[PDB]
Amino acid sequence: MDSERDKARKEVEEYVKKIVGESYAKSTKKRHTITVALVNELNNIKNEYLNKIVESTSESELQILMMESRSKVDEAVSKFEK
Amino acid sequence: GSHMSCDIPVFMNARTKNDFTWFKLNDTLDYECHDGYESNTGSTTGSIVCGYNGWSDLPICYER
Structure with missing residues (x-):
């Protein structure tokens, strides 16, 4: 369970880092305030799901949480134009 | 709790001389753009x- 928790934490962190990186890459002077709001929100989602993961008691729950974190990240991105 | 601090952010085309790795609420961080780059408002620096x-x-x- 410790190893699985570590893997789940890494997956959640890496996905958020990926999407934050994509948000930075596409940023422009005009889009900059979107980038700030979105990145703060993505890091907030990250913290929520890492906290759920650390206290999780089963492997299946970890898989559900990884999936839910990804969906919440993608939903946040969807609130702004591409 | 997670709303009581901020991690050093990712930088892009900018530097900081600040050597802290995480920050308390109301702490600040100064950045400077790389030569040839500017902030969203046209400045070479920000806080x-x-x-x-x-x-x-x-x-x-x-x-x-």
Whole structure:
């Protein structure tokens, strides 16, 4: 369970880092305030799901949480134009 | 709790001389753009503030 928790934490962190990186890459002077709001929100989602993961008691729950974190990240991105 | 501090942010086309790795609420961080780059408002420098939400602004500069 410790190893699985570590893997789940890494997956959640890496996905958020990926999407934050994509948000930075596409940023422009005009889009900059979107980038700030979105990145703060993505890091907030990250913290929520890492906290759920650390206290999780089963492997299946970890898989559900990884999936839910990804969906919440993608939903946040969807609130702004591409 | 997670709303009581901010991690050093990712920088893009900018530097900081600040050597802290995490910040308390109301702590600040100064950045400077790489030569040839500017902030979203046209400055070569900025100062950002750690808040409940995260950072007030991010150290991203843009090619002039």
